[PDB]
Design a protein around this ligand. Sequence first.
Ligand SMILES: CN(C)C(=O)c1cc2cccc(F)c2o1
Length: 168
Amino acid sequence: MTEYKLVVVGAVGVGKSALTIQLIQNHFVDEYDPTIEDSYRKQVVIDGETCLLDILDTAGQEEYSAMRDQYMRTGEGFLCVFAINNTKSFEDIHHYREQIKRVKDSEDVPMVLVGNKSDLPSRTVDTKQAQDLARSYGIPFIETSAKTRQGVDDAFYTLVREIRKHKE
Ligand SMILES: CN(C)C(=O)c1cc2cccc(F)c2o1
């Protein structure tokens, strides 16, 4: 039962903890609440491998400046959660990558690209754009709706896979 450090990254309004609450107790909150530091643990069987998920929710606001390259190193897998509602959240992911790369001390890294708010008719960015960008970094793109839990399960298992494939 291995514990993988899973940390989510994104902006305010995307719903990073939405995926976690949907997995822990399986509940979706309507009233968006800005989270600062929350830890979620649950025993899940990954492809037959019973593991313990040690997920940590990070702040979506750029408050921490000279304090990010501290706990960001302990993070194993990062969840690039963006929203198709606003392209701003899409470009925000880029900054996180640049930061993560310096913290990982390597060019390559096992990560996944997930597009939230896929169930909303407010599509500012298209699938091809996300797929195109994902192909450059060699990361898989999965559509994820936190409103009805669409693609969340798939994305979760795919992420853990990338981590295990990276080592084994
Ligand atoms: C109960 N949890 C989540 C921890 O003690 C932990 C710490 C931590 C730091 C960076 C990234 C992570 F995923 C992390 O998990």
